[PDB]
Every structure is written in structure tokens, then in C-alpha cells.
């Protein structure tokens, strides 16, 4: 139970570093290199918006910021100065399970190279083509693995205290 805290801290810092340093530049050209086979003005905008409603990197930044709020609350309380420890552990567990489930329900496990679109002003159905699908799939899988590790560790400690 001693090493579990050390590894939780290391996993958290590793995740923050990976997201902060490289993720902002895989997605930089997401819409500029999205293209559809069509001559209709406005079809690219509608089809990109329907294929990618919220970008992965925004979701990950939001999750990272939201999973650090109980610590800030505890720190502010202690600065003003055991039950608080229990409650914040419970809240962190709940938040991390919710975020992992939401990731699975929003994105799945892969990013395909083709997309079929039928939104106005596009006439009937059109075919569109995605940028960098393999790298984005790799990123998806890596983030899922890290978040799973964190969930396991927090449940470990929750059950250790009981």
C-alpha cells in the first residue's frame, strides 16, 4: 500500500506531461486537411461538425483539470486551518470512473479513415476523408490504458482503508 501512492503520483504526472507537450500538435490541422468529394459550398463545415462534435484534446484537458479539484479544496481548507480525506477520496473515485465511461461512450476504440455524411446543404450522401487516423487511434488507446491504471489504483486504496 506504500508504493501505490507513489505510482499514482507518477502516473498522474506522466499523463499531464504527455497531454501538455505533444497532444496540441497532432490535432492542429484537423479541419484544414478534412476534405469531401463535392462542389457544394458549406458541405465541408457541416460534415466536419457532425463527424467531430468535441475534439479529443478538449475533453482530455477538461478531464485533467476536473480530477484535481478535490486536492485544491483540501489544500485550501488545510491552509485555513480525516473525514475530509475520506470524502475527497470517494469523490475522486467517482469522477474518474465517470470520465472513463464517458470516454468509452463518446469515442470508442478507433478513428476510421472514411466518413459518410448526409447533412444539409449536402445533397444526399457524400464521402469525406480524415487526417492522421492511425496516430489518433494510438493516442486513444494509450489514454484509455492510463486512465484504467488510475481507476485500479484508486479503488485499491479505497478498499485498503474500507
Amino acid at each position: 500500500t506504500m508504493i501505490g501512492r507513489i505510482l499514482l503520483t507518477v502516473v498522474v504526472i506522466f499523463r499531464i506531461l504527455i497531454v501538455a507537450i505533444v497532444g496540441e500538435t497532432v490535432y492542429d490541422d484537423e479541419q484544414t486537411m478534412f476534405v469531401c468529394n463535392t462542389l457544394q459550398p458549406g458541405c465541408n463545415q457541416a460534415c466536419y461538425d457532425r463527424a467531430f462534435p468535441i475534439s479529443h484534446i478538449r475533453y482530455w484537458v477538461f478531464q485533467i483539470i476536473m480530477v484535481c479539484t478535490p486536492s485544491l479544496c483540501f489544500i485550501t481548507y488545510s491552509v485555513h486551518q480525516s473525514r475530509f480525506y475520506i470524502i475527497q477520496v470517494v469523490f475522486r473515485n467517482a469522477l474518474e470512473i465517470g470520465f472513463l465511461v464517458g470516454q468509452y461512450f463518446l469515442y470508442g476504440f478507433s478513428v476510421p479513415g472514411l466518413y459518410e455524411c448526409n447533412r444539409y446543404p449536402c445533397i444526399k450522401e457524400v464521402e469525406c476523408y480524415v487526417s492522421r487516423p492511425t496516430e489518433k487511434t494510438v493516442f486513444l488507446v494509450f489514454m484509455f490504458a492510463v486512465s484504467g491504471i488510475c481507476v485500479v489504483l484508486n479503488l485499491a486504496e479505497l478498499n485498503h482503508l474500507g
Copy 2:
């Protein structure tokens, strides 16, 4: 009444972080990906200007900066060194209610994908198409929720002292 201060501080910091880190890059391509169905030079400029007079991110930065002025005044006074506390609380309450009302009156609750324009030099009425409407709607709703929380908390403390 003890936790209310802690949560107000946490909400303020959370809002600042969310605005500072991600909001500058959803709106980056706002005008470059705005397009209208027309062959008239200058119509895109006029229609973009009429559809989006002040961008959301400018309004939010201004609001964030303006709601922190009473604290700076109090700090400068104390550095030079109860009535001041009362007055600054009143002013903060008023400013935050004004900004929330102004947000509601300026933008509403959604960003549509189509816009109908009838400004010179456009001939009669033309149709234009917006970039990333869903993400911008999500951002709008999130910011409204946070500001509502802050209003509630400040009224709480105002009525607590009385």
C-alpha cells in the same frame, strides 16, 4: 458558511484556467472558415461582422478581469495601511449579476449553423455557414452554469452577513 468561501475560490480558479488554456483555440479560425454563397466582393466581411459583433472570448476575458478589481483595491489599501469589506462584497455581487444578464441578452443559449444576411454590398438576402457551432454551444452553456454558481454563492454570503 465556512465551505462557501473555499468553493468560491475553487470555482474562480477553475473558470480562469478553462478560459485561459483552451478557449483561445476554438475561435482561432472564426473568420477564415466563414463562407457565403455569393460572387460579390466584400459580402463575407459585412455578413461576418453583422453575425458576430463581439466574439465570446473577448467578452469572457473582459468579465474575468473586471470581476477581480475590488480585490486589487482592497489589497492596495491594506498594503498602504470592515466597511471596505462590506462595500467590495456589494460591488462584486452587482458586477457579477450585471455580467450574467448581459451575457444572456447578447448571445442567448445556442449558436446556429446557418445565417441569413441582407447587408450592403450583398444583393438582397444571402445564406452563410458557420464553423464549429456545436462546440461553441457547449462552451456557452458551461460558462453560463459556472457564472450562475458564482452568483448563488456571493448572494449566500451577502445574506449571511446581512
Copy 3:
């Protein structure tokens, strides 16, 4: 007379923050989205240069830097270490009135959406179209209001000492 100093310091810091954080990005696309109805090479350059000789943001940065020089002089003198206080107050007053008058004479109170140009190599008179006129007008008015407040406060203190 006590609060006047506090509010002058707060106004100065507020102005610096507003100029530094957001103003660099309203004007970023000033020339790339300026367009004229013409087929003559070189007409866009001449008409943009005649319409906007010095950009607003350059003038504001220069003014902000120049109104802080008497303080730097006083600080350097004191570091090396009442008449100096008097003289620097006088100089600050003069500089701020000069800059406000110059702003009024250079730009006025609005930025129009159309511009009429008659400069070589343009044949006769041509019509050109501006980017983001409403936001720029709002910025103009806000900056004028802040500078007026600062002028009033400095005259207040000048007349207080006498």
C-alpha cells in the same frame, strides 16, 4: 484624496492588462482581410496604407510605455540616493493630456466599413472593405473612456497639492 491614488493605480494596471492580453489579436488579420474591387496589381497596398497609416495597437503600446517614464526616473534617482515628485507629476499630466488629444485628432470615434480610395496605381476612385469595424469601434471608445478617467484623476491630485 486617499482613494484617488488607489484608483489611479488600479486604472493603470487594468489598462495595461486589457491592452497586453487581447488587443494583439483583433488586429492580427488587418491587411490579409482588406480587399478592394479592382484588377490592378498594387492597388490594395496603396489603399490600405492610405486608410491605416499607423495601427491603433502600436499607438496604444507607445503611449502606455511613454506614460511610465517619470516613475522610472524617480525610481532610479531614489535608488542612487519632494521637488522631483512635483516635477514628475506635472510631466505625467502634460503627457497624458497630449496623448488623449492626439488620439482624438488621429482617429476620431468610429471605424467605417467602406473606404473610398484614389491613390496611384488605382484608376480613378475605387471602393474597399474593412475587417471587424464594430469591435474596433468598441475598443476605441473604451480606450478613450479609460484615458479620460486617468486625466481627471491626475488633475485632481495636481489641484489637491496646488
Copy 4:
């Protein structure tokens, strides 16, 4: 055995500096200057994705971050406060050998100027042309040499203690 530690530290810092300062800007135009001889929409995307599944710089950043985790664990343990030293040395050795082998299996020793592509929606086989192949080959060879040096040094110390 005294100098070996000094040179390991120097090699690590040298590698970090080289990757951090210059590598982000050789690869900046990787996809914008990739071009294929074709008139089919979407062929450039598919052929670029098949030729470069994971960019070199992403792999190198990931490797650099992952080879510094045992040190962070040891530091966190000591902050909380010989077997740990042994175990972390073993783990570092294993990680660095794995990463070097993976580099060899993923990329080889050269980047060619031409690429032959046969992925949908491209009709039959098409020819594509790469940007900056010589500089990228030089970078590949340099990184392999540095990582080899590091492997040798860590095996040296492992066998020194035994």
C-alpha cells in the same frame, strides 16, 4: 567507473536539449509539402498516413519521458523517507534496450525520397514525393548513435556492480 556516471548525465542532457530545441521544426511541414501525382480527392491523406504512421518526433519525446520514470519514483520514495537502486537500474536498462530495438524495427536507417502507394481511394499504384529526406536521415542516425552510447554505459555500470 567514476567518469561513467558523469558522461551518462551529460549524454542524457545533450539528447534532451537536441530533441527539445530543433527537432520540432524539421517536421513542421511534413504533410503540407507531401504531394502525389494524381487528381483523386483523398489520395494524399491515405498515402501520407500509410507512409508515416507515427512521426519520429512523437516517438522520441515519448521515449525520453519514459526513460526518466524510475528516477522520479526513487525521488518520491526518498522524499517520503540500496535494493531500490538495483531495481531501478535494472528497469532503466530494460527500457532503453527495448526502445532502441523498437526504433530499429519501426524506421530502419534511411528515409527515401519516393514512395509507392496503393491504398483506396487511389486507383492502382501512384508515386508520391517526400520533404527533406536527407536531414531526416541524418537525425535518425544521430539519435541511434546517442542511444547506443547510453545502452553501453548502463550495461557498463550494471556489470560493474554485478
Copy 5:
């Protein structure tokens, strides 16, 4: 003679701030908005290179860095620890007069809007058009004025000691 040092320090800092904060962004589009009336490939490159051999901002950065070297030498000497003071004053005077003369001989007092070019591969003489000439002329004049002030002050002190 007391105030002369204070004003020299203030002028130096003012010049550094003006060059560092704004000058990098007037010249950003220098070549992208340079255009010539021609259909010959390569003529724009040759004519831009002949019209602007060294950009103003490079010259000013170089001058600013080179006029601060005697101070660094004196500081390093004193850290290791009157004749040195004399010699460094002489050297600074010489360097600043040389740089002002070189500026006058390289650029003059204005930037014109048209340029006439006769370099290969351009056929006979062609006409080209410059970006932002008025702002660049204003910058030229301002920098000349500041450097003149600095020259006057340094000669003042040189003759004061004698």
C-alpha cells in the same frame, strides 16, 4: 551632470523596450506582401533582395546587442576582482557614432512606395510595390532621434571628465 546618467539609462531602456515589443510585427509580412507587375518566375525574389538587402530590425537588434558589450566586460572584470571606466566610455562613444553614421548611409530618411528593378531574370525594367511604407518611415525617424539623443549624452559625459 547628475541627471545625465539617469536620462541615459532611461533612454537605453526605452529603446530596448520599443524594439523588443513592437518592431518584430511591422516587418513580419515584408516579403509576402511584396508584389511586382510581371509573369516571369523568380523576378519577385531578385527584386525584393535588391530592394531590401538587410532588414531594419536585424540591424537594430545587432546594434542594441553590440552597444552593451563594454558594460559586460567591466562587470566580468569587477566580479573577478578607473582606467577601465575611461576606456569603456571611449569605446561606447565610438561604437554609437559608428552605428548612427552607418544607419544614415544604409537607409536614409524615407521608405518609398514604388521600386524600379532591372535584375535578371526580370526582362528590362519592372515596377514593384512595397508594404507599409509610412509606418516604416515613422520607425526610421524615431530610431534616428533616440540614437542622436544617446550620442549627445555620451559626448556630454566624455567632455565632462575630459
Copy 6:
């Protein structure tokens, strides 16, 4: 022999500052403004790669970093704590002579405005045109002069101790 160390330190810092602040922005448009007279897809890539195998700025950054390694080794040794001084001086001398010779053999003393290319897929020989040749020639000459000064000084001290 006293001043020689001071001037060596000043030259090193001057070189680092010049390379770090301005050199990254002369070369920014190196490939985007390279153009050849041809209609063949892929010829620009091959001819640019053959004309500029390694960019000047990469070579200079690498050289600057590599000539500071003996100092880092000596510092790490002393932190752990005359022969080391001797050896590191010898190594620095050798490295700086090698880098100067390599510069001369790689680039020479000028950058021409035209380039003649005969690489596949270009048909026979084609003519291409370079961006900013004069500024790049000036930079080449300046860097050679500085490195020569450094070589002279290090040989001076080597022969002083003997």
C-alpha cells in the same frame, strides 16, 4: 592573459545571443519561397533537398551545444568532489578547430541566387531561384569571423600554459 578569458566569455555569450534571437527567422521561409521553372510535380522537393542538405541554423545550434560539453563535465565532477582542466582545454580546442574546418568544407563563403538542378523527376536540367541570398551570405561571413576569433583565443591560452 588576464583579459583573454574575459573576452572569450564575452564572445561566447555574444555568439549565443545572436544565434538564439534572430537566426530562427531569416530561414523560416526557406522552402516556401524556393521556386523552379517547371511543370513537373515533385521537382521542387528534389531540387531544394539537393541544394540545401543541412540548413545553416541546425549546424550552428549543434556546434554551439557541442562546444559547451567539457564545461558541463568539469562542473559535474567538481560538484561530486588541474589535469582535468588541461584535458578539457585540449578537447575544446580540437572541437572548435574541427567545427570551423567543417563549416568551410560544407558551405564556403557565399550563397548564390541561381541553382542548376538535374535530379529525378526533373527532366534534364532546370533553373531554380533562392530566397534572401545576401542576408544569408552576411550571416555566413559574420559567423566565420566570430569562430576564428574564438579559435585564436583558445590557442593563445593553450600556448600560454604550454
Copy 7:
């Protein structure tokens, strides 16, 4: 009544010559120089078809051919060989009055330079521009005048016989 036949024959031949020699080349560019202010594919086709359902020259050729059929019938009868004369005169009168009335109801008296179109796939209403409107108006008026003359003459002879 003697000259009436001579002038009828001369008018008929004059009309045939004018239609046959020049009319085919005023209308040659009717659709190639028709243009609408729009970016929608297919709008030009629909708007041209709605503005000009049957071209003038087709109608005039058809009318000219149809008003010569009674003569051909009479000639064929006589070749095979007073009541027939009467009947054919009646039929010619009726046909020429019908054709003049139809011309008035189909085309009117002018061809305007602008046209307002609201047909699918055009979005809302668009503005289109016509080629050579003045010449076509002149042709319309001339043809109406000639046909009126012919009607008058044929009624003259009809009433002469009775």
C-alpha cells in the same frame, strides 16, 4: 389594288432576306454570355431556361415557313391539273393574324438587361444579366412593324374581292 400585290411580294422577300442573313448571329452567344451572381452549380441553366423558353429566331423561322404553305399547296394542285384561291387567301390571313398575336403575347416590346430568378437549385432569388438587349429590342420592333404591314395588305385584298 395592282400595286398591293407587288408590295406584298417585296415585303415577303425583304423579311426572308433579313431573317436569313443576319439574325442567326446576334443570338449565337445567347447562353455563353448569360451570367448570374452565384456559386451554386446548375443555377445558370435553370435561370436561362426560365428567362428564354423559346428563342426569337426559332419562332421567326417557324412563322416564315408556315406562312408559305398555302402557296405550295396551290402550286402542287395546279401542277397536277378560283375557289382554291379564295380559300388559300382566307387561310393566309388567319395564319398571319394568329402569328402576330402570338408574338405580342409571348415577347412584348422590349428585352430588359436584368432578370430576377427564383428556380431550384438557386437559393432564394438571384440576379442575372443579359447579352445584347438593345439590338434584340430593335430586332423585335422591326419584325413587328413588317408583320403589321403584311397583315394590312392581306386584309386590303380580302376586302377588295369580298
Copy 8:
């Protein structure tokens, strides 16, 4: 029965004149003004070929030539020189009924303005737009009416002789 021959001859000559003089120029731009909403090379060719397999004017020329062959045979026989009259009348009747039926089965009674296409290399279904549909519909109806008249007359004479 006397006039029937005269009117048959007149109808035949009228049809020949109408087809020969004007029909070649309604269809002249048939493929050059056919356009589809797509970016796929080769789709316009396939969709035009599927929409219009044999052009109307070719069919009409062929029919006109083929319905005059029995007369040529009879003329050649008589030049070499009642049963032949009978047989040629029968054959003409059969040929004209066959051609009218074939017209009805090939083309129908209208030409629509839109066409829906699903032929390779077009992806799924695309929409295409036709040139001059109303004029072509008018021509179709006129030709059907004339051919009906001719059929009626030939049956009349066939039944007259019996």
C-alpha cells in the same frame, strides 16, 4: 382523295425543312453545358452517356432518310423501264408506324431538367443538370404531331385503294 396526296407532299417537305434548318443548333451545346455536382474525373462523361444514349436529331435524320427509300427504288425501276405501287405503299406505311412507335418507346413526351446518376466512376448517386429542356420538349411534341398526321394520311390512301 385528291387533296390527300397534295397534303402528304406538303407535310413531308415541311418536316424536312424544319429538321434541316433549325434542329442542328438547339442540340449543338448538349454536352458542353451538361454539368454534375461532383469532383470525380470522368463522372460527367458516364452520366451524359447514360442520360442521352442516342440524340434526338440523329434519330430524326435517320428516320427521314429511311422513309424515302421506296420512292428511290420505284424511280430507279421506272428509269430502267401497278403492283410496285401497291408494295411500296405497304412498305411506307409499315416503316412510318414502326418509327413512330420506336420514338414513343425511346423518348416519351418530356425532357426533365434534373437527372439522377449512379454509374461508375461516380460515388453513389449524383445529381446532374440539363440544358434547354423546354425547347427540346416542344420539339419532341411537334415532331410527334407531324408524324401522326403522316400516318393518318397514308392509312387513308391505303384504305381508299383497298
Copy 9:
């Protein structure tokens, strides 16, 4: 008076031949090579229509046909078969004087190379450029000379009979 008839016949035939053989091909590209300096759709059509309301060649064909009508009337009368001779001579004289006067009032004596246009949808005044002005001026002058000769001859004969 004998030769006058011979020369009138020769002049008439010469004029007909010159108009019929070459004039149709100087004017063929009249609108396709007409160009204006503008980006407004529809401006070329309006400005061409205002500059050239009726083309020269149409006017000349009409005049040639109309001056031969009295001869056709006289021929038809004589075929059916001195006062008629007198009347037709008078009518021919009147028609030829009217046509010459109309030519002078419609076109003048030259065709300029530039045209200044101020018709909707053109914004203010624009400059347009004409095709083949010198050849058209030569043609104008030649036709005026020939028509003058014909007028003189017909007046000669009119006064000869009296």
C-alpha cells in the same frame, strides 16, 4: 451621262463584294475581346452594350438590302406587264441621303481604344479597352467615301433628267 450609269453599277457591285467577303470577320471577336478593369459580375455586358448598341456590319447589311428595293419593285412590275422610272430614282436618292446622314450621326469618323463606363452594376466609373480600333476606323472611312460617291452620281442623273 453615259459613263455615269456604268460607274454607278460598278460602285454598287464593289461595295456589295467588300461588305460580303471580309466585313463578317473583323467584327467576329467584338465582345469576346472586350475587357474592363473590374471584379464585378455583369459589368462587361452593360458596358459593351452601352459602347456598341448596333454593330457597324448590321447597319451596313441593312442599308445595302434597303437601297435595292425600288429595283425589285420595278422588275416585278415590268414582269407583270417612264413615270415609274422617275419615282424610283427619286426614292433611291432619298434613301441614300438618309442612310449617309444616319451613319454620320450614329458613328462619326473614328473608333477610340478606351471607353469610360458608368452603368449599373458597375460601381462609379470604370475603364474598358476595345479590340481592333484602327482597322474599324479604316473600314468606317472607306464606307463613307463609297456612299458619298454613290450620292453624287445619283444626284448627277436626277439633275440630268430634271
Copy 10:
């Protein structure tokens, strides 16, 4: 045997009329509407030349002219004036069988819509698309049928005389 000559003459005239009146305008756009999926200059020319070495209409005109030479020889002989009749019949038979066989060996029975090309300067194999394949197939089949009829008739008469 009497009717055989009449039908041979009718078939010959029918074939000449069909070829002369319509065939020149199906093939008019043969190369202008031929397109290949490629960016290589010169590939369209080579692939069109390899797909269609001799156009159908040229072959048919040549055949028609060459099968009428024996008649011209016989006519010229008789004008100068039974064995000649025999010889010319034999020659006509041979020529018509040769031309039919050559048609079968050159073109076959269909024109496909796609063509696969591998000629320099095209890189590897490319796909090209044909204009009006169905109409051209119909024309091929019709011409084969007519020529077969003619062959049968000429063999008939040859065997009739013996």
C-alpha cells in the same frame, strides 16, 4: 436478278448519305472530351493516340471513295470509245471483302468507356475515360450490317453471271 441491281444502287446511295450528313459531328469532340486521371503533362496526348490510331470516320470515307474507282475507270473508257465489265465486277468484289475484313480486324464490335494506358510519359498505368461510347458502338454495328448486305449482293451477281 433484276431487283438486285436496284437494291445495290439504293444501298450505296443510302450509305453515302448517312456517312456524309451525320458522321462528321459525332466524332467532332473526340479528343477535347478525352480525359485521364493524372497530373503529368503530355499523358493525354499519348494515351489518346494509342487508344484511337485512326478514327472511324476517316476509314469510312476512304473506303467509300475507293469502292467507286472501277466505275470511274469504266466511265472514262466508255467516254473515250464486256470483258471490262467482268474485270471491274471482280475488282469491286475483292475490294469490298478486303475492306470488311479490315474493319473487323481494326475495330471489332464495341467501344468501351474505360481505357488502361501505359505509355511514356505516363507513370506506370493510368485510367482514361471515353466520350459517347454507345452512339459510336451503334454506328459501328450499322456500318457492318450495310457492308455485309453489299458483299452479299455483289457475290449474288458474280455467281449469276459465272
Copy 11:
């Protein structure tokens, strides 16, 4: 003197045939393939007009028609029916010498491939390129030779009669 008339008639007919059959199609693309190195609208029109004021083929048609007028006069006289023969011979001689001299003074003996133009709206001097110069030079020389032959023959006969 007998053969001279025969050869004059043959030369005249040969010249007419050569001009009528082929000359109309060398000059067909005269302005469409004329191109200048410039970006100025309207420069091509002015430079083409200045380089080719009257096209060769127009001059040759005019000359051919004008040298046949004396024959028409003589024919008309004889139809109405030695001195006339004399006078018409004199006139033909004069006309043919005048036309040959005018050709020499208008065009010379060659058509160059380059043209240097300095007409408004072209800026300074521009270079333009001609279509088919060699064929046009050959045509010039051939026409001069034929006209010389005709002049010689007519002088021959003039001096023969005396």
C-alpha cells in the same frame, strides 16, 4: 506576244486560287495566340493593334478585287453596245504598280518573332511574342514574287502596243 496574254490569265487565276483557298486559315488564330509578358489588363489589345494595324489577308483581298474593276467596266460597256482598251490597260498598269509599292512600304520582307511595345496602358516597354512567323514570311515573299511577274507582263504588253 501571243503567250504573254495566256500567262497573264494563268497567273491571275493562280493568285486568286491561292488567296481564296488557304490564306484565310493561317491568320485565323492571329490575336488568340498573341501573348505579352505582363499582368496589366488591356496591354495585349493595345500591343496587338500597334503591331498589326491591317492584316495581310485583308490587304490582299482588297487588292485582288480592285485590280479587276477595269475589266468589269469594259464588259458592261460592251454589253450595252479600241480607245477603251488602251485606257483600261493604262489604268490596270498604274493600279498594280501602286499596290506593289504600297505592299513594300507597309510590310517589308519579314515577320519577326518578338515585338517591343510601349503603348498605354502598358508600363514602360514590354515584350510580346508572335504566332507562326515563318509561314507568314513565306506567304509575303510568294505574293511579292507573283505581283512582280504580273507587273512585268503588263508593262510588256503596254510597250508592245506603244
Copy 12:
């Protein structure tokens, strides 16, 4: 010797028909489909002019017209009315041998698909691509064969008379 005249007449008429009916339309697109791999304005004109100085069809028309002049002379002589027969036969023989030799020396026996050009304004050597080379080669060979036949026949008759 009887049939030789008949076959000469037939060959002459056959050649005239083949040249007149089809040859004008193989060469119609000769320059419009000529293309070179270059970006230099004016290079296509110079290279086309150097590759094809005189077009085949012009040479063939000229030859056909010139080989019929002796017949016209003989006809004109006889109309005015054995040695003349002899002389004209000799002249025809000479002319036909000269024209065949000139054809061989001007064009050879094939038309290649590629052409290598080195004429100003083209830089060094460029590659260009020809239209319809195979058809043009076939035409060349056919014309050579026919002219050879004619030469043989005329020599036959020349030697027959002696």
C-alpha cells in the same frame, strides 16, 4: 499506253478528293493541342514554329494547284485558236519530280511524338509533345505512294512518245 491515260486521270482525281475532303480536319488542332513542360511565356510559340515551319496540308494544296497549270495554259491556247503538247508534258514531268523530291527533303517518312527544343525564350532545352502523330505518319506515307505512281505513269508516256 491506252489505259495509262485513264489511270493517270483517275489517280489525279482520287488525290484531289482525298486532300480536299478529309485533310483539312486532321490538322485543325495542330497548335491548340501542342504543349511543352515549362512555365515560360512564349516558349510554346517558338517551339511549335521551329518544329513545324510549313504545315503538310499547305504544301499539298500548293503542289496540287501547281501541277495543273500546263493544262490551263494549253486550254487557253486552244480556246484562242503538237509542239505545245510535248512541251507541257515535259514541264509536268519536271514539276512532279521536283515536288516529290522536295517532300522527301522537307518531311521524311515519320512524325515523332516527342520534340526537343532549345529556342529563345526557352531556357536551355525543353521537351514538347505532339498531337496525332500516327495518323499524320499514315497520311505522309499514302501521299508519297500516290505521287510515286503519278511519276511512274508520266515517265511511261514520255518514253512512249520519245
